[PDB]
Amino acid sequence: DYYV
Amino acid sequence: EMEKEFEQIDKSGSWAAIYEDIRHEASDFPCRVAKLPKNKNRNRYRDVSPFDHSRIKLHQEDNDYINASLIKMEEAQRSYILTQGPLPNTCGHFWEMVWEQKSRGVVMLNRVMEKGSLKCAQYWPQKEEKEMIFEDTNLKLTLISEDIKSYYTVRQLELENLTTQETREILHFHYTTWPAFGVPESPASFLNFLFKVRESGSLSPEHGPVVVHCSAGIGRSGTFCLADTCLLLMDKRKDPSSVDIKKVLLEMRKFRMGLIATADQLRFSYLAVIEGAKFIMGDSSVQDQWKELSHEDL
């Protein structure tokens, strides 16, 4: 649930 | 002719070099409301938040927060709202935003499922007879008709305000073949889609800003709004060569973090703005070449  | 700065970078091969420079120079404003705990479940990603200064506010007395940003391009004279793919609990907020901001179009650039990852809730009705009712925000949403194509679909929706019983038509433009962290199949595919949006009237200034979203609302969404804005400036200034794509992107990043997510998306932005300038230069018939070249029928 992180973008990067 | 900014085709120079392009061939220079491709031969030089320094696209990632240039992409990383924008990350370093890009603005950095507080995201305080986004980070409150009562809003942890209204954000899809924990490293993607709207700046306090440009965030959209719901006209709610309890919690007015949604992960969306108003991108007001002052010179180009167009505003956009970039938001994340709605969450199971934020669908009502999404359409409340659409209503309160008077938007007329929604541009969706992801799919609900992407490489096995759930990137977005199913926030619009797929069947005419199965309409959605968002009780938290008092809105009703009904599929009226749809126009399917090779790589995109345009839907006509009716959004009703259950309180005032007022109704509005919303155009949903769904790009179905744009991979996360990827690029469109060809500049023609993209520009045919963009001009389909332009021609529909959803971008006119008598309407609220168009809502643009993908998964996080920064990567594919950023590519879309960057190309449209550069073509607007190209035409406003009345000079293709004047538009500095890197500078326009950094202006957009004052309003939402992270716009454009890879070096390849940035290169496609150049490619798309370069192709589209043909139309702005006066070759109005290139548009029909894009339609034929995009295989939009099948």
Q: Does B48 touch chain A (CB under 8 A)?
A: yes
Residues paired with B82 in a beta bridge: B69, B212
- Half-sphere exposure of residue B218: CA atoms within 13 angstroms, side-chain side: 22
Task: Count how many domains chain B has.
Answer: 1
| DSSP code at position A2 | -
- Test A2 with B216 for CB contact under 8 angstroms: no
Torsion angles phi and psi, residue B98, rounded to 5: -55, -45
- Half-sphere exposure of residue B145: CA atoms within 13 angstroms, side-chain side: 2
Q: Could you tell me where the DSSP H helices lie in chain B?
A: 3-12, 15-25, 32-35, 91-100, 187-199, 220-233, 245-252, 263-281, 286-293
Catalytic residue among B31, B91, B120, B214: B214
Tokens representing residue B105 in the block: 């179009």
- Helix (H) or strand (E) holding B83, with range, is strand B78-83
Q: Which domain holds residue B4?
A: 1-298
Annotated catalytic, B91?
no
Tokens representing residue B288 in the block: 């029909």
| DSSP code at position B2 | T
Say if CB B66 and CB B97 are below 8 A apart.
yes
CA distance B212 to B101: 13
Contacts of B47 in chain A (CB under 8 A): 2-4
For residue B84, give how far its alpha carbon lies from the nearest alpha carbon of chain A (Å).
12
Torsion angles phi and psi, residue B21, rounded to 5: -65, -35
Task: Tally A–B CB contacts below 8 A.
Answer: 13
**R_g (Cα) of chain B, nearest Å:** 19
CA distance B162 to B2: 51
Q: Can you tell me which residue has the tokens 């920064």?
A: B218
Q: Does B258 touch chain A (CB under 8 A)?
A: yes
| DSSP code at position B208 | P
Contacts of A4 in chain B (CB under 8 A): 47
Contacts of A2 in chain B (CB under 8 A): 45-47
For residue B68, give how far its alpha carbon lies from the nearest alpha carbon of chain A (Å).
16
Do β-strands B139-148 and B55-57 pair in parallel, antiparallel, or remain unpaired?
A: unpaired
- Half-sphere exposure of residue B151: CA atoms within 13 angstroms, side-chain side: 20
Contacts of A1 in chain B (CB under 8 A): 44-46
For residue A1, give how far its alpha carbon lies from the nearest alpha carbon of chain B (Å).
5
Written as one letter, the residue type at B49 is S
CA distance B237 to B281: 12
- How far does CA B125 lie from the centroid of its chain? 20
- Test B46 with A4 for CB contact under 8 angstroms: no
CA distance B237 to B72: 18
Q: Can you tell me which residue has the tokens 């155009």?
A: B171
SS3 content of chain B, % helix, strand, coil (to 5): 40, 20, 40
CA distance B48 to B64: 18
CA distance B77 to B236: 9
